[PDB]
Design a protein around this nucleic acid. Sequence first.
RNA 1: CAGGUCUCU
RNA 2: AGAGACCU
Length: 462
Amino acid sequence: GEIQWVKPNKETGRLNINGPTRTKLEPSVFHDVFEGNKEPAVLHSKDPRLEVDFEQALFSKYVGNTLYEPDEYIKEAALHYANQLKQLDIDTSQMSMEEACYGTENLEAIDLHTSAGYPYSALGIKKRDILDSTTRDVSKMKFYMDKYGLDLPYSTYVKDELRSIDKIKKGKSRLIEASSLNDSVYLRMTFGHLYETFHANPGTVTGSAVGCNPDTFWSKLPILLPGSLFAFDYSGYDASLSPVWFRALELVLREIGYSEEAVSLVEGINHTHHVYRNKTYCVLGGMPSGCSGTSIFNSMINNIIIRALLIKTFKGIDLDELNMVAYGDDVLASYPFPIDCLELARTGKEYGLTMTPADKSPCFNEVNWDNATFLKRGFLPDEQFPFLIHPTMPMKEIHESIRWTKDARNTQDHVRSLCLLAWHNGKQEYEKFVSAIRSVPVGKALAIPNYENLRRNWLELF
RNA sequence: CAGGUCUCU
RNA sequence: AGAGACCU
Ligand SMILES: [Zn+2]
């Protein structure tokens, strides 16, 4: 992606959009019990912790664009992925505004706890003022779809969250692009059934993990991904995407049967307009992280990317022997012979993609099941039942989370969730974690799950 | 102060 | 109907 221009709002006639400037995060009662290196992200240009210009660092992620149109590898790549999707039988027909607004068995309803975006969020109009769970009213939606139209600008905000000390020094917080309610509704009408099918089918047919439950899914992955593993990381994935990948996505949607009216909506996320504070800017390429379909479209494009890199990097690649699952930019894949990712990374460079060794490794090493990660979790065979696989969130990560809160009223639920993650690391690690919690007065007031109870419930899942 | 998935009372 | 965990 690449910023095409920046203009003052006066010049463009867009309302200003300001976000909160102080973090909601505060040190928790456990802050000094556990070690950790993360602090709330820089939210303000005048943050004492900064070491660079804030706004400069914020938009450095739009590194630029290489290809605008598909070459032959990408075309073949897209067609291979699109054919594989055909067996899913995605319903290319348009979903109903009520279903799109209020949800289905495989698609959650539009979030009403959350901003309506441009221009409502500056006219003091909340989504609860337009929709109603209990009515399933679509009557006010239709009205505002007509008053304000589609292709409304995204509203740029900085993300309030823990970040490592380095990224706080270097001002590399993340940006969130608030969609307009109008475009969410309409994208959900055009692609709702695709979303539904994807959510229902995590695995190697969709090539996607959206909708997986790591407790159970992790036992399936070494069967779905047989042979030699490969993996790697992306830097600035969403923003590094050139328009060719949106052209490639259009190819897939077409091949599985979407109308041209449906396929036309892709250009409206490849080319977007954003308001940050008092300015308007234009972005070409780059996924707008905050549009409907963000996780799924990023995942689909990733499926195209991997295929294209393989056949352009190596000779004799049979794409039918590829197995992969993606969650946005996160990927785990296998092939019947080892794949050198150093060479894939070099081809990736020509495509404007920056690919690094899996898991912040210094160099591209071998990936096996003992050191692979996915959604940050390792893979650890159960000592009693080795075919049952524990997802393992690292204790270091869990320590970072517990050292802060945004609202100490819900401390019980926070610590419980971490316990659900911790116990997979084993009895010894879990009792060490629990007893550190107990070492402090509110720690003795919490209801903490029993290890063998967690385990027994896990086994019952099968 | 966005789009989502997962889990819990 | 609440809450938390995790991906962008
Ligand atoms: Zn533009």
